[PDB]
Amino acid sequence: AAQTNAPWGLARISSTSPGTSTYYYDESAGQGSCVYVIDTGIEASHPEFEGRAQMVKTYYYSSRDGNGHGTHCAGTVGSRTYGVAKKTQLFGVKVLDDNGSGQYSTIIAGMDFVASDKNNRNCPKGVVASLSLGGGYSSSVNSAAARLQSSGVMVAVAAGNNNADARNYSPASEPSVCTVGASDRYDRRSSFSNYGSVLDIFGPGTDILSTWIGGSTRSISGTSMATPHVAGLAAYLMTLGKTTAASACRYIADTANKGDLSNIPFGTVNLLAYNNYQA
Ligand SMILES: [Ca+2]
Ligand SMILES: [Ca+2]
Ligand SMILES: [Cl-]
Ligand SMILES: [K+]
Ligand SMILES: [K+]
């Protein structure tokens, strides 16, 4: 299938070269997969979600996304126009308040919640979690991410936006999850993107158009925007039978566009998420 005039990031994920605007993907489109977006929540009523999104959990007085960030990440995972996996099921877990903040113990509880909650969902093709959040290093936070991955969930986490070595951030520094750096449309490392040997992959992160709250849309930038491309990619590949939750991060690294990004620091992977789709 072919989506013309797609967001640049979607076109980039299905391309061997920058500078194209059509997104190519197998029509299976992540059908029968699930992706949890652990974030400020998801405006499930947005027309772009088409009934495929819902809130399953909050830690605050509401499950409403009053920020917009979780909606944007979710729209990149699986919205009809702005998503990688256009037919996936989306589950919202509100660990971050409407300011985009959340205590580490709440974030941990959300990740353990998904590890159990997947047992209450229909996801024959596999389960992904997209974690577009971080703070300083915490072994508790890393361990929680490690359990979620261990339980059978493809975990994708933002490297962070400090233009620094992601070893000092969590859950970015957890070796067993998929740590995602950000690139721009000219294949430069995003200026804010974290880096380091703990990075597994890069996705589109700068000027990423997607859903927003109040049923609208906007472009914003961050390793938070790159993470859902990789999460949406994993869901899509799992529907295709190409990989599993334990192996998806490796499979994505293995099948990446290689050596193509500029300003990648020595010692950091030069790998750009790519679906390898032949139309
Ligand atoms: Ca990692
Ligand atoms: Ca890893
Ligand atoms: Cl409110
Ligand atoms: K630096
Ligand atoms: K190359």
Please enumerate in sequence order all residues whose Cβ is within 8 A of that of 114, keeping only pairs 6 or more positions apart, or say none: 36, 38, 91, 93, 129, 148, 153
State the DSSP code for 163: S
Sign, Cα dihedral of 30, 156, 15, 4: positive
Q: Which of 124, 211, 128, 139 is closest to 175 using CA atoms?
A: 139
Residue type, 14: S
Q: State in words which class domain 1-279 has.
A: alpha beta
Ligand 1 centroid distance, CA of 180 (Å): 8
Residue 157 assigned to a binding site: no
Burial 66-81 (b: 16+ CB within 10 A, else e): ebbbbbbbbbbbbbbb
Residue 26 assigned to a binding site: no
Positions marked active-site: 39, 69, 224
Q: What is the CA radius of gyration of the chain?
A: 16
State the DSSP code for 259: S
Cis peptide before 171 (omega within 30 of 0): yes
Quote the CA–CA distance of 32 and 237 in Å, as a whole number: 11
Ligand 1 centroid distance, CA of 216 (Å): 33
The structural domains of the chain, with segments of one domain joined by +, span 1-279
Paired residues of 91 in beta bridges: 36, 54
Quote the CA–CA distance of 170 and 155 in Å, as a whole number: 13
Residue 117 assigned to a binding site: no
Quote the CA–CA distance of 120 and 9 in Å, as a whole number: 32
Q: Which of 265, 229, 271 is closest to 25 using CA atoms?
A: 229
From first CA to last CA, the distance across the chain in angstroms is 7
Q: Is 7 helix (H, G, I), strand (E, B) or coil?
A: coil
Quote the CA–CA distance of 263 and 149 in Å, as a whole number: 30
Ligand in closest contact with the CA of 170: 1
Ligand 5 centroid distance, CA of 269 (Å): 13
